[PDB]
Amino acid sequence: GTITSQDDNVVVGYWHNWCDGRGYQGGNAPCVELKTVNPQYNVVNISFMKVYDIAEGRIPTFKLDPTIALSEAEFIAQIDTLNSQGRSVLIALGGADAHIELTRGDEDALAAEIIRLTDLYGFDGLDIDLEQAAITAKDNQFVIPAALKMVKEHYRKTGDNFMITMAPEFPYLTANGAYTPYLTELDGYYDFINPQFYNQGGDGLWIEGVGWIAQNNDALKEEFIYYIADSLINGTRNYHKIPHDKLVFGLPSNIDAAATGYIQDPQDLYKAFDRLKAQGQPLRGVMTWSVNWDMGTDAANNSYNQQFIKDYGNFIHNQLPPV
Ligand SMILES: [Cl-]
Ligand SMILES: [Cl-]
Ligand code: NA
Ligand code: NA
Numbered sequence: 001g002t003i004t005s006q007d008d009n010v011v012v013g014y015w016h017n018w019c020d021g022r023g024y025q026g027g028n029a030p031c032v033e034l035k036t037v038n039p040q041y042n043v044v045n046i047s048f049m050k051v052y053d054i055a056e057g058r059i060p061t062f063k064l065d066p067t068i069a070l071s072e073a074e075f076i077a078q079i080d081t082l083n084s085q086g087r088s089v090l091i092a093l094g095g096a097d098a099h100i101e102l103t104r105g106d107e108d109a110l111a112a113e114i115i116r117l118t119d120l121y122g123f124d125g126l127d128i129d130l131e132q133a134a135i136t137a138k139d140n141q142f143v144i145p146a147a148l149k150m151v152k153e154h155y156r157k158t159g160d161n162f163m164i165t166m167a168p169e170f171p172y173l174t175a176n177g178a179y180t181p182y183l184t185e186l187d188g189y190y191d192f193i194n195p196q197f198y199n200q201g202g203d204g205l206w207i208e209g210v211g212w213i214a215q216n217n218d219a220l221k222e223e224f225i226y227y228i229a230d231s232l233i234n235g236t237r238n239y240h241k242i243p244h245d246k247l248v249f250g251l252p253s254n255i256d257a258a259a260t261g262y263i264q265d266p267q268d269l270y271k272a273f274d275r276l277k278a279q280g281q282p283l284r285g286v287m288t289w290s291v292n293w294d295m296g297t298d299a300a301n302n303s304y305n306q307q308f309i310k311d312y313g314n315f316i317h318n319q320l321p322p323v
């Protein structure tokens with residue numbers, strides 16, 4: 001394919017390589033064709049690159065799930081289409097039950113596999129989306145960055161910006177937290193980070209004059225967005241620094257998509273984002289788990305009707321370009 005990178009704001013959505021996932025409130029996430037995904041998702045993350053069978057060894061790979069009833073050639077054609085529209089298609093490495101447990105020395109094979117898949121499908125980059133058990137499994141913290149630096153250099157030789165993004169769960173972004181080796185090794189290689197501000201229950205931060213602000217507190221959602229982002233973009237309040245132009249705020253698309261974290265009132269985001277912008281540190285966009293959920297149904301089979309992209313697409317894409 002052709003490597004198609006993003007230079008401006010992003011609305012990132014994950015795409016399920018499976019069908020009919022059950023939601024946290026009993027809804028359903030269908031498989032969907034890439035051509036069906038709303039065009040305001042300008043980064044779409046194919047979920048997931050993983051180990052499918054230990055007989056194949058340690059190096060993860062990708063296989064389009066036959067249940068989606070899309071041929072590989074047609075999947076590739078649809079990637080092609082997204083790329084013609086200026087949209088990126090990343091491969092997401094990890095996910096639940098991915099069995100990624102790499103040993104030092106595996107970085108050459110992992111880089112080679114990434115390049116092979118990138119060249120085959122036309123992917124534009126890779127998202128590191130490891131499950132909790134994988135963050136510090138075996139030599140993952142060494143191998144995965146080492147592999148990705150080689151990939152990045154490989155495409156730089158031909159003038160292509162192979163995108164590297166990550167989806168850490170936010171509590172692992174404390175100073176010296178478990179995700180920090182990925183971030184420090186890949187500083188100058190990653191394009192943006194889209195942490196998961198969801199599925200962390202009552203984790204959060206204390207702010208003088210406001211009090212305890214949890215990820216699951218709807219009444220303080222503006223404050224949570226603002227302060228957790230402010231902390232990350234400045235490296236304050238015991239968080240590792242992720243520059244604002246490289247920080248994308250990850251959210252569930254709806255209450256089926258994640259156990260906690262859904263933004264009930266989008267104005268809480270609009271206001272938090274505007275405060276970050278006003279202090280000269282606008283964020284780079286939003287991310288969601290997932291396009292399939294945004295296109296999914298609740299327990300009574302009512303369509304979620306693309307409510308996430310309706311709420312945030314225009315808001316994000318109408319902002320000024322990053323610097
Ligand atoms: Cl699912
Ligand atoms: Cl579809
Ligand atoms: Na077997
Ligand atoms: Na293989």
Ligand code: NA
């Ligand atoms: Na068709």
Ligand code: NA
Binds near residue numbers: 001004083122
């Ligand atoms: Na491409």
Ligand code: NA
Binds near residue numbers: 200201202203
């Ligand atoms: Na906890």
Ligand code: NA
Binds near residue numbers: 218219220265268
């Ligand atoms: Na409120």
Ligand code: NA
Binds near residue numbers: 245280
């Ligand atoms: Na800046």
Ligand code: NA
Binds near residue numbers: 008009317319320321
């Ligand atoms: Na623009």
